[PDB]
Curated annotation (Swiss-Prot), chain A:
Quaternary structure and partners: Component of the mitochondrial small ribosomal subunit (mt-SSU). Mature yeast 74S mitochondrial ribosomes consist of a small (37S) and a large (54S) subunit. The 37S small subunit contains a 15S ribosomal RNA (15S mt-rRNA) and 34 different proteins. The 54S large subunit contains a 21S rRNA (21S mt-rRNA) and 46 different proteins. mS47 forms a protuberance of the yeast mitoribosome and retains a solvent-exposed cavity likely capable of accommodating a substrate, in accordance with it being an active enzyme as well as an integral constituent of the mitoribosome.
UniProt protein name: Small ribosomal subunit protein mS47
Species name: Saccharomyces cerevisiae (strain ATCC 204508 / S288c) (Baker's yeast)
Residues of the full protein shown: 34 to 250 of 500
Function: Component of the mitochondrial ribosome (mitoribosome), a dedicated translation machinery responsible for the synthesis of mitochondrial genome-encoded proteins, including at least some of the essential transmembrane subunits of the mitochondrial respiratory chain. The mitoribosomes are attached to the mitochondrial inner membrane and translation products are cotranslationally integrated into the membrane. mS47 has enzymatic activity in vitro, and is able to catalyze the specific hydrolysis of 3-hydroxyisobutyryl-CoA (HIBYL-CoA).
Coiled coil: none
Remaining remarks: Present with 3950 molecules/cell in log phase SD medium.
From Swiss-Prot, chain B:
Section covered of the full-length record: 107 to 159 of 318
Gene, per the UniProt record: PET123
Assembly notes: Component of the mitochondrial small ribosomal subunit (mt-SSU). Mature yeast 74S mitochondrial ribosomes consist of a small (37S) and a large (54S) subunit. The 37S small subunit contains a 15S ribosomal RNA (15S mt-rRNA) and 34 different proteins. The 54S large subunit contains a 21S rRNA (21S mt-rRNA) and 46 different proteins.
Native species: Saccharomyces cerevisiae (strain ATCC 204508 / S288c) (Baker's yeast)
Function (record text): Component of the mitochondrial ribosome (mitoribosome), a dedicated translation machinery responsible for the synthesis of mitochondrial genome-encoded proteins, including at least some of the essential transmembrane subunits of the mitochondrial respiratory chain. The mitoribosomes are attached to the mitochondrial inner membrane and translation products are cotranslationally integrated into the membrane.
UniProt-recorded name of the protein: Small ribosomal subunit protein mS26
Subcellular location: Mitochondrion
Family per similarity comment: Belongs to the mitochondrion-specific ribosomal protein mS26 family.
Note: Present with 2010 molecules/cell in log phase SD medium.
Transmembrane segments: none
Lineage: Eukaryota, Fungi, Dikarya, Ascomycota, Saccharomycotina
Length: 217, 53
């Protein structure tokens, strides 16, 4: 009866995953993570799905404002530590699935991509940014650590002043917000596409297919 | 003739009981079969749905 937290739809041979928690800026809870993790395993087995597209239904307001840690805090105050460990096992397991996924995943970072949102895009070779992109890792102000494998990605993908993870440490320790073109130039985004062109791109992604006897992997 | 009348009556009564038992079995099997059909599988995640609407 209630609107599902994450919506799944078909786009020709592409499968669109849309985060559907607009009031929470698409914050990721255990329910969302579990749903996405299970549906991605099915798409991996399917021979009719060529690629996946992870977007939000709230763009350009936000793509994912981060994992739902406010709920994890209440669990700690209530000693519901089993609930908290379930929230992190689901999220981190989804971040590991995306990183090792054999089919192309294309994340549309059209809006605030902070925290868990970074985990949804940083692990995909096709992480598209827009003028509305706002990448940040504001965990130091909440007392947490840089999670979602950001300590394995940022030290390996940043482009400038990252010979010894200097820039990676700057973003993780200061929580600086990077915006649009700057995220693309730093390596946080693989591509820079105007938000207006996302509809057209989505259609083209659904229409392309592996040629002859080549699999999508 | 006494054996014929008593075997026939027994056969009729035994046939009613067998039908009642058979029908109940079929009914139970149908419920089990239907329950398996309604069981959610992992493949169901790839079927698009609009439950709310």
């Amino acid at each position: 009866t209630d609107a599902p937290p994450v919506l799944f739809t078909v786009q020709d041979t592409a499968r669109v995953i849309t985060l559907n928690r607009p009031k929470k800026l698409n914050a990721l809870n255990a329910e969302m993570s579990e749903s996405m993790f299970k549906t991605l395993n099915e798409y991996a087995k399917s021979d009719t799905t060529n690629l996946v597209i992870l977007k939000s239904s709230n763009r350009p307001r936000s793509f994912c404002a981060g994992g739902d840690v406010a709920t994890v805090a209440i669990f700690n105050f209530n000693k519901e530590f089993a609930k908290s460990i379930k929230f992190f096992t689901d999220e981190y397991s989804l971040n590991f699935q995306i990183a090792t996924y054999l089919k192309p995943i294309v994340t549309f970072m059209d809006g605030i991509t902070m925290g868990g949102g970074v985990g949804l895009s940083i692990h995909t070779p096709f992480r598209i940014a827009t003028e509305n992109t706002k990448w940040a890792m504001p965990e130091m102000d909440i007392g947490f650590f840089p999670d979602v494998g950001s300590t394995f990605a940022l030290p390996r993908i940043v482009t400038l002043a990252n010979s010894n993870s200097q820039m990676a440490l700057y973003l993780c320790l200061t929580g600086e917000v990077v915006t649009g073109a700057d995220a693309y130039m730093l390596g946080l985004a693989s591509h820079y596409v105007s938000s207006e062109n996302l509809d057209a791109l989505q259609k083209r992604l659904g229409e392309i297919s592996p040629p002859f006897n080549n699999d999508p992997q | 003739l006494i054996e014929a009348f008593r075997k026939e009556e027994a056969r009729l009564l035994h046939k009613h009981e067998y039908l009642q038992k058979r029908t109940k079995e079929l009914e139970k099997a149908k419920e089990l079969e239907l329950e398996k059909l309604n069981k959610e599988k992992s493949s169901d995640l790839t079927i698009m749905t609009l439950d709310k609407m």
